[PDB]
Design a protein around this ligand. Structure first.
Ligand SMILES: *[C@@H]1O[C@H](CO)[C@@H](O[C@@H]2O[C@H](CO)[C@@H](O)[C@H](O)[C@H]2NC(C)=O)[C@H](O)[C@H]1NC(C)=O
Lengths: 409, 406, 388, 425, 387
């Protein structure tokens, strides 16, 4: 028969799962962790949660489950269900939902030395405070914090995995099992053991194993699908300075329509970023700037229309203003005779009034051109500056700026 | 009671609920399956799923749970928790989520003759394929397939539940009118039940309960069809406005954008299958294409109205059609100083001659535009009325068959 | 059944479910694994997750569960609950949102020779490498990677039932078409442990999207507004409605871009063709708005301040209008009274000359519009003939 | 601790079987007194037609196997036992939307020395409440929590209503108990009537599990301030702008824009109202009826503004002003509506005569155009005086008829009892 | 450890977790309850539900779980699964969507003197009355009511560990600020049960919303669109665009009001100041549209059918224009003879009619300049008051 039968019966007989396998009082179990990332499933910005598919490798040394191989026909390795063994309650402390433990309770590999090797897979949803100051060019700094839910530093000593005699200080990524997210590219993946010095060696929160994921958003999709249409639409405000300043020119129509388009784009952006209030996203700042510029241009269109459509009846054309805006910036015979004279006089007055209207139109055109040259420059400078400072947001060269180490295999 | 406890101890001394009760090897277990629909909760068209609150009336015979009532002070029947007795693994095979088994585990009722009865309540998400040809004037045909997940036709025989009197088999879903909640959006036309086999799989037999349910389309009518009718009315009207008004594009484009928004928002409530296009979406596309053609023809009319002899010369065929033939059919018929003074008067007279001639030709162009506009008005009114009436008459004549075919 | 009760009592009296079913520890359990796709629940492109309803048929041999039928009344098959016997921990490697292993422990058939067949159901939410580059006419290939988790190839061996997953009882989705499907067994050797291979079975399905819904609901309105884009060139400038038409077309296209971006994932591996073409149509609408603003400015140009350059007159009045064949273009007190009449004549002279210059400017603007309209019509004709 | 000895005697020595009813004889029945305490009304999703309520769903019954003599032990007058150790009746909310039938938390049961068992578990119940959208947003809903006993039939256990004593006589509690202080009044809904009734169905046999039930009704009225301020007022004002659009001149070139913009705003409001209600076809909501009527009226306004514009821009060269229309729209209607009010010499002479003739024809043309303008003014003034009173009367009638909608001040129309906490029967 | 497993076997050999941990049944178990807020997951204003991640620290004394360290190799502390021993049934009274009791049954520390320490984590989805009067600058005050469900004050007594919850490990929300937090203990004597006190501990948190998301995404665009209301008056009527601008501003404002409505609970307890201000803005915009339509109608008043009343001429032409300063306003020849006289008289009549029309246009100009000055005064006083 399968010789593992009597071996497992002997091992699991007289074995209390609820007892830590401390050989003596001062013995501390050296629990060893190692994370393997198979897929960065998603990063929910609105909920601020990173969803990952990771195998967690936990190694320890339970002295109770050891045997002499020659006694069991050279059996040097068995599999025991994890629900039957003592386990270090290594849990993800910073989960967003209530999921602390692992998804699937895989078997534990037991070696005759007593070495315990547990490799359960898990879907982890871990909180990741998102810095939106440079969206959509941002890079996020997401972290996974593992700690023993039950035991403290006087019973369990969390350590990072030591491979080939050198400590594994990174989230191991197996090229055979890895599908790059496509939206987020992983730049740095360091790992380190951390201490909360506010607490003593007790309190269960003294020691942690933190795995960091410095991920960078690929901006091409956001650039093409949001930023480029927004810039193209916001570049239309400067066109209102070439439409005629009269009925049917439709300066105000174009200006207000571009304002409404920018409002719609602001609403669209509001759906793509978290509702945190620590900073304004870069695209949000650009949208606020262009909406303010378009409002100023609406005011300018109203002013230009009011200037151009003035008449001598309502307003008087001062000579100072005219010089400023046109000199520096740019029986029956008697009745018939009386009737003819009146006709000539009326025609002369009408022509003079038309000329005054034309002068007002010319002043309006001059103001219009000067304001166009101001507004085009303002819009171009704002757009170029904002998206240049967006493009110049690099991921730090080192995983920790204080440290000089790369944390790569 | 003491005697009930003694009887329970006697019955379950060696009873193993993991063993199908067969007195002789090869005997089958007759299982009667019936459905009671307390409430048809939801028909989610988006995910093609039907959520229902049901009682799954099951009944079989267990020769092991047999006793003499006279030996236990006349205990006719018992209520035993469903975890203690063997039950067939009757599950809903076509569920949408992973819920196969029954939500609520009520006690079974064991008669002294071994007849076990079970009435477990459940909330089932059954997957239902949706025919979107006539949405929202449509009737759906949603099935609920029940069968034993483990035991095949060689171990359990599925039958139909007997009525309350226990005389005849009930071949339909039982609706208890005293404890039933009308859905309010659907009406249950037919509710037959029928056994189904498979030709290629003799070990397959299941009981399917069909729900032929007709949608009540008042909500979709009120909130989508009438506003689009008003939009189409505006799209017809745009051809009655005079080109001088300067609001033809405003009206036509506003109608186009409104109907596009209606289409976009109604795209949320329709399923995303590509087997057919719902009649409401076809109507919306018809209205949208018609309004786009209205915009194009309004642009053509505006172009015709604003021409001038200094810019265009009227072709002979346009004059032959729009000036002479159509208007009858559309009922839309219509000393040095003295020398200089005389020269000035003569020049003014010639200027007035030229102005009158130019104005007359411009009037001819504007009349061409007006006649074409009136023709467009009549044609578009006829087309819109015919199309809307045809589409909604086709939709209105869609009812579930009188024979449920099940 | 009495005989079945006795048989079940005897089978599990000293049966340990922690022990592999092998006569000797060096052997391996040969497991036959087959997938049966009952239904394709969904393909979530934004989250890149494929939800499928499957049956995971597993067959193997358990020597410890054998009996002689003649001793138990002739019973040859029983249904034991799966929680009582050894089961293979078969895990979906590329799970994305669901459960890794089987969670619905149904009963399993067990013959008298030890043969065990187990058919548990499952909802697999696998991870799908969605490639939106021909959306909505795309073809998606994404897999279901299964394997024994805690056993290598020297302890538990899995082999597919058949070269293809069983789709006999497949429920047609109505949105996707099962073009192809295959199941491949993989041997993976790691540098750590070359002696022990790791076995794997990858089932892949090629889904072809049925595009009618997306066509009708997105593409046709977008095509309609793209066609209406070039209609502004036929609108006369005097009407003062070109801005309304052009800007409304732009707003409709920005709304439809909003619709597109919420339909496809935010991945940057490949730019969708629909989004790229929508961006191209937006660029066209912006160019049309700019050039029609130029046209409006030219049309309303004041003849007093602006005088027509000779080259403009030659190009747009002397040569281009002849090119268009399909166009209909044209190619005491008495002395005071006398002086007043003369002044009226002079003012009419000046008005006629200014109106002639303004008419020339309007003619140039009309020629520009007609050039652009001809270009747009040529583009439309070429596109319609080429693609359809 | 004597409690350990008492519980060991009750549940181990006496062989307590938690799957057997607490009756000396099989034919005996167990009375399950019930009551409900509404600690908080979580919500009522009209779109989902779900009533989410936080309740404490009390039970009280008798268990002759859980009796003891307090004198023999220490004077233990009460005992706490986990519910999974003693028989408990499985009262289930039959009309729940989700799969949660039982109580969420299985708290301990109190046992008196005389066998009286009490059990007060809290529960979050998502019951199914059909929604009457006829008078939205001034509507009042009538939800119900229907509790039935499915594990047993009426021949084995009898559901009841908890009895309370004030002056030596027991009155059944026919209402949901609401603690005046612990209960936080919901912002959107207020409870008008909360009756509790034990229904028996005579058309079914006692052997069935559907022969009886206890239903706690909950008539709740919506506070309409929120929707009136945020949805009805903007709609009414934007609608009135449509009738005001009749006052714009034809030369303005903005009549159609104003009317169309009002129509689009009304359409958006209708769509948003649609989003907020269940897709039921029992009736069109009051706000829905008002929106439909106002959109139809604004469409009429748009059409009639189009007619006025068509009338204003007519000219003698395309249309003829008949005497009938002239006298109708320029004599009668303006009064009714009170509207306001040598060779060179011959050549020169001929040229002057021609100039005079052309100016006279121009004057006649402009006179006809002005007459058409006056006709348009008459038409749209009549349109205003016809439509705006209809608009205001329709708005007032709809939003007063809806306001005159109250719960009937007595649940169970045919029952004179008030079902109130202050006057038990 | 063989000593530890022997000790655990000895402890729970005859331990009945149903019983209370008291030497005599008349005593009461004193339980020290402390709350440790780890994170504030969310505050759903619409449903009025606050979801928080907490650790519910509890301490008490179980006399049955005492042992002598000298007999077990000097063991002082052990860890036991929480399900093996008696536990208090602490219930969050105001639970809204979550679970009433603790469901994560983590291990507990057991001391050699019988002192039990238990710190199970939890996700409290507690009901939170939301006051939206000062949205989005509001502060919320809601609570976590904890208490022993089935035990009165004479059987199990809970006392707070400290006057405040332990926010030492609190994760900063980025949307709310912990202005204050405090825990109180309440005695309740119900009319049924005067002899038995009912105890409960209420932990309340004062949360201050950080107003930057809504200032950027709601208030700023609303101000930008409301400021455009004043441009309608400065726009001359001849442009034929007053209605376009005014109507567009009104539609944008109503859309913004609808969004603001969607961002607040549907409760009618109080009307938000932001919502009330938006309603007043819409009312003022509609009044502006009414006056704009009046101005447009006045500007096009034909002299043929309208005569300017003296009360209009006296005030709008001779009273206001002198008051407002900053503006810059104010055979066959017989036929020829007869025709020339007709032309002269026609031009005289045209001049008179044009003069009346210009007077009407002047009246419209002074009216909308008065309205513009009113708007500027409102703007200045409002920006000073807010500042
Ligand atoms: C609230 O609803 C309940 C049931 O949905 C109503 O109770 C029924 O009322 C009708 C109306 O007369 C009676 O004919 C039935 O006999 C009642 N049924 C029961 C079981 O009592 C109740 O009347 C409704 N309340 C109000 C105020 O309308």
């Amino acid at each position: 028969e399968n010789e593992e039968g009597r071996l497992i019966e002997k091992l699991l007989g007289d074995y209390d799962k609820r007892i830590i396998p401390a050989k003596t009082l001062d013995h501390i179990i050296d629990v060893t962790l190692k994370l393997t990332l198979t897929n960065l499933i998603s990063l929910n910005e609105k909920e601020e949660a990173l969803t990952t598919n990771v195998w967690i490798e936990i190694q320890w040394n339970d002295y109770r489950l050891s045997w002499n191989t020659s006694e069991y026909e050279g059996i040097d390795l068995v599999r025991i269900p994890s629900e039957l063994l003592w386990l270090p309650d290594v849990v993800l402390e910073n989960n967003v939902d209530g999921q602390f433990e692992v998804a699937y309770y895989a078997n534990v590999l037991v070696y005759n030395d007593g070495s315990m090797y547990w490799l359960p897979p898990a879907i982890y949803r871990s909180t990741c405070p998102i810095a939106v100051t440079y969206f959509p060019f941002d890079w996020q700094n997401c972290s996974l914090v593992f700690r023993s839910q039950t035991y403290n530093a006087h019973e369990v000593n969390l350590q990072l995995s030591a491979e080939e005699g050198e400590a594994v200080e990174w989230i191991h990524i197996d090229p055979e099992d890895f599908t790059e997210n496509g939206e987020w590219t992983i730049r740095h993946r360091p790992a380190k053991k951390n201490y909360n010095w506010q607490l003593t060696k007790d309190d269960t929160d003294f020691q942690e194993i933190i795995f960091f994921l410095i991920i960078q958003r690929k901006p091409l999709f956001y650039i093409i699908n949001i930023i480029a249409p927004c810039v193209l639409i916001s570049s239309l405000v400067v066109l209102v300075y070439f439409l005629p300043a009269q009925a049917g020119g439709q300066k105000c129509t174009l200006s207000i329509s571009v304002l409404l388009a920018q409002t719609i784009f602001l609403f669209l952006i509001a759906q793509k970023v978290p509702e945190t209030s620590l900073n304004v996203p870069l695209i949000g700042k650009y949208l606020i700037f262009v909406m303010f510029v378009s409002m100023l241009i609406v005011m300018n269109c109203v002013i230009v229309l009011n200037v151009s459509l003035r008449t001598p009846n309502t307003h008087s054309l001062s000579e100072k203003i005219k010089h400023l805006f046109l000199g520096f910036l740019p029986p029956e015979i008697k009745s018939c005779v009386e009737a003819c004279n009146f006709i000539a006089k009326s025609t002369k007055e009408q022509n003079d009034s038309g000329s005054e209207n034309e002068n007002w139109v010319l002043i309006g055109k001059v103001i219009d051109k000067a304001c166009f040259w101001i507004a085009l420059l303002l819009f171009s400078i704002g757009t170029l500056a904002i998206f240049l400072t967006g493009h110049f947001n690099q991921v730090p060269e080192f995983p920790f700026p204080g440290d000089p180490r790369k944390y790569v295999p | 009671s003491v005697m009930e406890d003694t009887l329970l101890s006697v019955l379950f001394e060696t009873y193993n609920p993991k063993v199908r009760p067969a007195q002789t090897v090869g005997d089958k277990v007759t299982v009667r399956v019936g459905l009671t629909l307390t409430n048809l909760l939801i028909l989610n068209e988006k995910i093609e799923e039907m959520t229902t609150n049901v009682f799954l009336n099951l009944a079989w015979t267990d020769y092991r749970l047999q006793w003499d009532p006279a030996a236990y002070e006349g205990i006719k029947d018992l209520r035993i928790p469903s975890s203690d007795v063997w039950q067939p693994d009757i599950v809903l095979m076509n569920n949408n989520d992973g819920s196969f088994e029954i939500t609520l585990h009520v006690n079974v009722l064991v008669q002294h003759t071994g007849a076990v009865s079970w009435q477990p309540s459940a909330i089932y998400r059954s997957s239902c394929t949706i025919k979107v040809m006539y949405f929202p004037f449509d009737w759906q045909n949603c099935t609920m397939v029940f069968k034993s997940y483990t035991y095949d036709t060689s171990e359990v025989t599925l039958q139909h539940a007997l009525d309350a009197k226990g005389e005849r088999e009930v071949k339909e879903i039982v609706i208890n009118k005293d404890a039933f909640t009308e859905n309010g959006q659907w009406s249950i036309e037919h509710k037959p039940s029928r056994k189904n086999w498979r030709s290629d799989d003799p070990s397959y037999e299941d009981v399917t309960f069909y729900l032929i349910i007709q949608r009540k389309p008042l909500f979709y009518i009120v909130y989508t069809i009438i506003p689009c009718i008003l939009i189409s009315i505006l799209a017809i009207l745009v051809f009655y406005l005079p080109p001088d008004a300067g609001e033809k594009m405003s009206l036509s484009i506003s109608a186009l954008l409104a109907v596009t928004v209606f289409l976009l928002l109604l795209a949320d409530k329709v399923p995303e299958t590509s087997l057919s296009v719902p009649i409401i979406i076809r109507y919306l596309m018809f209205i949208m294409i018609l309004v786009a053609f209205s915009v194009i023809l309004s642009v053509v009319v505006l172009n015709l109205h604003h021409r001038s002899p200094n810019t265009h010369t009227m072709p002979n065929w346009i004059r032959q059609i729009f000036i002479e033939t159509l208007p009858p059919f559309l009922w839309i018929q219509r000393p040095q100083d003295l020398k200089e003074a005389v020269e000035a008067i003569k020049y003014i007279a010639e200027q007035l001659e030229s102005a009158s001639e130019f104005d007359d030709l411009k009037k001819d162009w504007q009349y061409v535009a007006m006649v074409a506009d009136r023709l467009f008005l009549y044609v578009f009114f006829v087309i819109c009325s015919i199309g809307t009436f045809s589409i909604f008459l086709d939709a209105s004549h869609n009812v579930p068959p009188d024979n449920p075919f099940a | 059944s009495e005989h079945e009760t006795r048989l079940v009592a005897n089978l599990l009296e000293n049966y340990n479910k922690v022990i592999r079913p092998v006569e000797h520890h060096t052997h391996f359990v040969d497991i036959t694994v087959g997938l049966q796709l009952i239904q394709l629940i969904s393909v979530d492109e934004v989250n890149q997750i494929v939800e499928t309803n499957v049956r995971l048929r597993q067959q193997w041999i358990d020597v410890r569960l054998r009996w002689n039928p003649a001793d138990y009344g002739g019973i040859k098959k029983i249904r034991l609950p799966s929680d009582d016997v050894w089961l293979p921990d078969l895990v979906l490697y590329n799970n994305a949102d669901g459960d890794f292993a089987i969670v619905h422990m149904t009963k399993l058939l067990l013959d008298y020779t030890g043969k065990i067949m187990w058919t548990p159901p499952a909802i697999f939410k696998s991870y799908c490498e969605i490639i939106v580059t021909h959306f909505p006419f795309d073809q998606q290939n994404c897999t279901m990677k299964l394997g024994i988790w805690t056993y290598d190839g020297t302890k538990v061996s899995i082999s597919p039932e058949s070269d293809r997953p069983d789709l006999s009882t497949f429920m047609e989705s109505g949105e996707w078409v099962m073009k192809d499907y295959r199941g491949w067994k993989h041997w993976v050797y790691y540098t750590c442990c070359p002696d022990t291979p790791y076995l794997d079975i990858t089932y892949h399905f090629i889904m072809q999207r049925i595009p009618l819904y997306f066509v009708v609901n997105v593409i046709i309105p977008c095509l309609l507004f793209s066609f209406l884009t070039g209609l502004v060139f036929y609108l006369p400038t005097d009407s003062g409605e070109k801005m309304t038409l052009s800007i409304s077309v732009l707003l409709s296209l920005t709304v439809f871009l909003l619709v597109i971006v919420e339909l496809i994932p935010s991945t940057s591996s490949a730019v969708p063709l629909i989004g790229k073409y929508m961006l191209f149509t937006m660029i066209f609408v912006i160019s049309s708005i700019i050039i029609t603003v130029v046209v409006i400015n030219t049309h309303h140009r004041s003849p007093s301040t602006h005088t027509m350059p000779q080259w403009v007159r030659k190009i747009f009045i002397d040569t281009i209008p002849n090119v268009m064949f399909f166009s209909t273009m044209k190619r005491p007190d008495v002395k005071s009274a006398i002086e007043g009449v003369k002044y009226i004549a002079e003012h009419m002279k000046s008005d006629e000359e200014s109106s002639n210059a303004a008419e020339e400017w309007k003619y140039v603007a009309m020629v520009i519009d007609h050039i652009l309209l001809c270009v747009f019509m040529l583009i439309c004709i070429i596109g319609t003939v080429s693609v359809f | 601790n004597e409690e350990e000895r008492l519980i060991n005697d009750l549940l181990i020595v006496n062989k307590y079987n938690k799957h057997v009813r607490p009756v000396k004889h099989n034919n005996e029945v167990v009375n399950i007194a019930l009551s409900l305490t509404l600690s908080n009304l979580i919500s009522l999703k009209e779109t989902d037609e779900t009533l989410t309520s936080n309740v404490w769903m009390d039970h009280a019954w008798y268990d002759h196997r859980l009796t003891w003599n307090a004198s023999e032990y220490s004077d233990i007058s009460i005992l706490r036992l986990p519910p999974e150790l003693v028989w408990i009746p499985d009262i289930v909310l039959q009309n729940n939307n989700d799969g949660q039938y039982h109580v969420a938390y299985f708290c301990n049961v109190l046992v008196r020395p005389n066998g009286y068992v009490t059990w007060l578990p809290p529960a979050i119940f998502r019951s199914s409440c059909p929604i009457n959208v006829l008078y939205f947003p001034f509507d009042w809903q009538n939800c119900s929590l229907k509790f039935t006993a499915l594990n047993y039939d009426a021949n084995e256990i009898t559901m009841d209503l908890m009895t309370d004593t004030i002056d030596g006589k027991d009155y059944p509690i026919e209402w949901i108990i609401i603690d005046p202080e612990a209960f936080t009044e919901n912002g959107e809904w207020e409870i008008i009537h909360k009756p509790a009734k034990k229904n028996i169905y005579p058309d079914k046999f006692p052997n069935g599990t559907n022969y009886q039930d206890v239903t706690f009704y909950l008539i709740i009225r919506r506070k309409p301030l929120f929707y009136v301020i945020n949805f009805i007022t903007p709609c009414v004002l934007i609608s009135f702008l449509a009738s005001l659009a009749f006052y714009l001149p034809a030369e303005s070139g903005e009549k159609m824009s104003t009317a169309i913009s009002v129509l689009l705003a009304q359409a958006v409001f209708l769509l948003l109202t649609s989003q907020r209600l269940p897709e039921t076809a029992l009736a069109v909501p009051l706000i829905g009826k008002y929106l439909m009527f106002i959109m139809s009226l604004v469409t009429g306004v748009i059409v009639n503004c189009g007619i006025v514009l068509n009338f204003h821009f007519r000219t003698p060269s395309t249309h003829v002003l008949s005497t009938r229309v002239k006298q109708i729209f320029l004599e009668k209607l303006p009064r009714i509506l009170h509207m306001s009010r040598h060779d060179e010499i011959k050549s020169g002479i001929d040229s002057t005569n021609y100039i005079v003739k052309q100016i006279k024809e121009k004057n006649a043309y402009d006179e006809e155009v002005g007459n058409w303008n006056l006709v348009g003014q008459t038409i749209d003034r009549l349109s205003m005086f016809i439509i705006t009173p209809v608009m205001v009367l329709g708005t007032i009638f709809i939003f007063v008829m809806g306001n005159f909608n109250h719960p009937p001040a007595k649940p169970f129309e045919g029952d004179p009892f008030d079902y109130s906490s202050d006057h038990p029967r």
